Amino acid sequence: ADKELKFLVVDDFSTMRRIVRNLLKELGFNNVEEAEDGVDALNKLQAGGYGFVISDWNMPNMDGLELLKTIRADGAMSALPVLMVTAEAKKENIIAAAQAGASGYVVKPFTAATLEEKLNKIFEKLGM
C-alpha cells in the first residue's frame, strides 16, 4: 500500500465524499480526488494517475454499477480496483457487484476500521 495511491471517491452527495476523504486521510491516504457521478468519474479517470476507486451505488447520469462495468470494459482502466458502496446489504446488489467485477463492497455508513479492513483485503488480493 503506497500512501500516495490516487483515490477517486465517487458520490453525488458531497457530504458522503467529505466523510470518505477524511476516513482515508485518517488511514494515511492523502491523494484523494472526487467525482459526482459515473460520467464525471469517467472523465476524471481519463487523465490517468489513479490507483483505486471508491464508488457509491445510485447516482444520476451514470450509476455505480455502470461505472464499474465501463471501467472493466476499458483497456487502460480494466485493472483498477473498485470498492462499491451500497446502502443496503441486499444480496441482489452484492451479487451484481461481484458479477460485474468489483473488488469488494462496503455498506454505509461505515467506520474507518471497516474501511481499513476492506482496503487491506483488496490490497492483499493484489499484493500492492
Binding site: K90, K91, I94, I95, A98, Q99, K121
Partner: protein, 70 residues
Amino acid sequence: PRRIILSRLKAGEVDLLEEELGHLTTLTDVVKGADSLSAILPGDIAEDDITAVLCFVIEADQITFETVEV
C-alpha cells in the same frame, strides 16, 4: 440439496464468510474448523454467484460444492 466446503481459511476468515453467506442464503449444518467451514445450502443462489461474492475474500480454489442425499 447442496453443501459448501471452504478450505485454507485464515484466522477469523471462517466467521467472516459465515456472515457473508448469511446475506445470500441460509446455512444449516454449519461446521467451523480452525481453517475450514462447511454448510448445507438450499437451492437458492446459483453456485457462480456464491463463488463470485466469496471471491471478494478467498480464491476460487478454496471453494467446493458437494451434493448430499436425504
